[PDB]
Amino acid sequence: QFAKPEDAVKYRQSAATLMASHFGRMTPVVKGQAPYDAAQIKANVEVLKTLSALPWAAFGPGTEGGDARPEIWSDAASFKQKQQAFQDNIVKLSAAADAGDLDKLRAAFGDVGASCKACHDAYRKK
Amino acid sequence: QFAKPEDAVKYRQSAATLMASHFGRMTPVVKGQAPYDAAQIKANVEVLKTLSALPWAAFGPGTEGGDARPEIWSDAASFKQKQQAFQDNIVKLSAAADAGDLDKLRAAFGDVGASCKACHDAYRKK
Ligand code: HEC
Ligand code: HEC
Ligand SMILES: O=C1O[C@H]([C@@H](O)CO)C(O)=C1O
Ligand SMILES: O=C1O[C@H]([C@@H](O)CO)C(O)=C1O
């Protein structure tokens, strides 16, 4: 869907920006600094679910640019491992949210965050 | 969810960027220049549905900035009219996509695009 590689870069960066907001805005809730409204979090995690599937299609071959390492391309099976583990942790977060279980939400939130960071540490330029 | 007004600006601009890609990537299909796969379009319109709800919460009071006119704030009931008409046209696009009806998809796509443009013409800086 991208006329030039730059358009893929702008897409994936925008998708990432939205995931960071929908993930990070839950920080006060999982820390207990903001109230836990199970319906609010269920709805927010549904948005994050949708967003979480979007970046990966915007790293097609030859879309080197942005802060994307060429190893995304030179080490591709491993990159797919990191995005599928991340998406699998998003499924677990959805399950915790859908269950209305705050302790499980805390734990699942942390697993997601660790997956974000593991991919960045390997595949995102400093 | 925004620590400073700039963060709301960056969010709404990123949401807009993603809607432009998910809307605009259908142009070749509605023109007949790319094949029409009803399931592909249904899935894409579901993504656009989700995205289409996101910008509006990132124009809270005092989030003047970006290319957002202060009339979004000084003429607020009218801005809400333009975002609800747009969201209502997204419902019609969803219905056309879910029905697998290409002629209806063409027509609904055009109505959505006109709603985007009408809001920009009134409320987006040049
Ligand atoms: C690999 C499988 C990743 C996972 C999982 C997550 N992110 Fe990511 N992110 C990744 C790359 C390769 C890049 C660079 C993209 C580019 O071309 O520049 C990014 C970038 C971001 C950014 C910065 C966006 C920008 O505005 O430039 C953010 C804020 C970000 N990523 C957040 C984020 C979050 C919150 C994630 C988990 C919920 C997450 N990423 C996962 C690769 C990967
Ligand atoms: C008002 C009810 C709008 C409707 C409907 C749509 N858009 Fe919009 N858009 C609107 C404003 C006020 C702004 C400026 C935001 C800011 O603070 O700068 C925008 C911006 C955009 C952009 C540019 C994003 C950027 O990267 O800076 C794009 C690409 C865009 N809008 C696209 C878009 C599409 C495709 C829409 C219909 C599907 C649409 N917008 C509707 C206000 C409104
Ligand atoms: O909110 C975010 O969470 C991850 C990471 O910081 C988690 O460790 C990331 O990259 C964000 O923008
Ligand atoms: O794809 C887009 O459609 C609208 C508008 O051009 C429709 O007339 C817009 O602002 C886009 O980025």
Side-chain angles (χ1 to χ4, degrees), chain A residues 12-98:
Chain A
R12 70 210 187 200
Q13 293 180 345
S14 285
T17 295
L18 303 167
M19 287 197 299
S21 178
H22 285 278
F23 180 72
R25 71 180 58 194
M26 301 185 286
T27 294
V29 175
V30 295
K31 291 185 170 188
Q33 295 166 9
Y36 175 51
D37 173 328
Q40 175 182 214
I41 294 297
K42 181 179 181 178
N44 184 64
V45 174
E46 287 158 346
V47 174
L48 180 59
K49 174 176 178 202
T50 298
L51 294 170
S52 72
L54 302 182
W56 323 111
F59 297 87
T63 68
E64 285 80 356
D67 288 330
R69 285 181 169 169
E71 290 75 19
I72 292 177
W73 298 281
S74 64
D75 301 322
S78 302
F79 186 76
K80 193 163 181 169
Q81 293 161 4
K82 294 243 199 278
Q83 64 96 339
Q84 290 284 279
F86 167 64
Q87 291 191 263
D88 293 343
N89 277 328
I90 289 288
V91 174
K92 184 148 37 55
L93 183 63
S94 294
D98 292 354

Side-chain angles (χ1 to χ4, degrees), chain B residues 16 19-21 23-25 27 109 112-114 116-117 120 124:
Chain B
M19 287 197 299
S21 178
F23 180 72
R25 71 180 58 194
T27 294
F109 179 90
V112 168
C116 312
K117 178 177 186 302
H120 295 155
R124 188 173 72 180

Side-chain angles (χ1 to χ4, degrees), chain B residues 2-126:
Chain B
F2 303 121
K4 300 190 172 158
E6 285 91 342
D7 299 310
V9 177
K10 289 158 184 189
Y11 179 101
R12 70 210 187 200
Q13 293 180 345
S14 285
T17 295
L18 303 167
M19 287 197 299
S21 178
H22 285 278
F23 180 72
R25 71 180 58 194
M26 301 185 286
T27 294
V29 175
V30 295
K31 291 185 170 188
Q33 295 166 9
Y36 175 51
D37 173 328
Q40 175 182 214
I41 294 297
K42 181 179 181 178
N44 184 64
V45 174
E46 287 158 346
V47 174
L48 180 59
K49 174 176 178 202
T50 298
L51 294 170
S52 72
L54 302 182
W56 323 111
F59 297 87
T63 68
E64 285 80 356
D67 288 330
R69 285 181 169 169
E71 290 75 19
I72 292 177
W73 298 281
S74 64
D75 301 322
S78 302
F79 186 76
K80 193 163 181 169
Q81 293 161 4
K82 294 243 199 278
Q83 64 96 339
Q84 290 284 279
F86 167 64
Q87 291 191 263
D88 293 343
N89 277 328
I90 289 288
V91 174
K92 184 148 37 55
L93 183 63
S94 294
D98 292 354
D101 186 320
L102 182 52
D103 284 14
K104 284 179 145 257
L105 183 80
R106 279 196 323 158
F109 179 90
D111 290 347
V112 168
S115 296
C116 312
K117 178 177 186 302
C119 185
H120 295 155
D121 285 347
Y123 293 113
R124 188 173 72 180
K125 298 184 177 206
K126 287 177 174 45

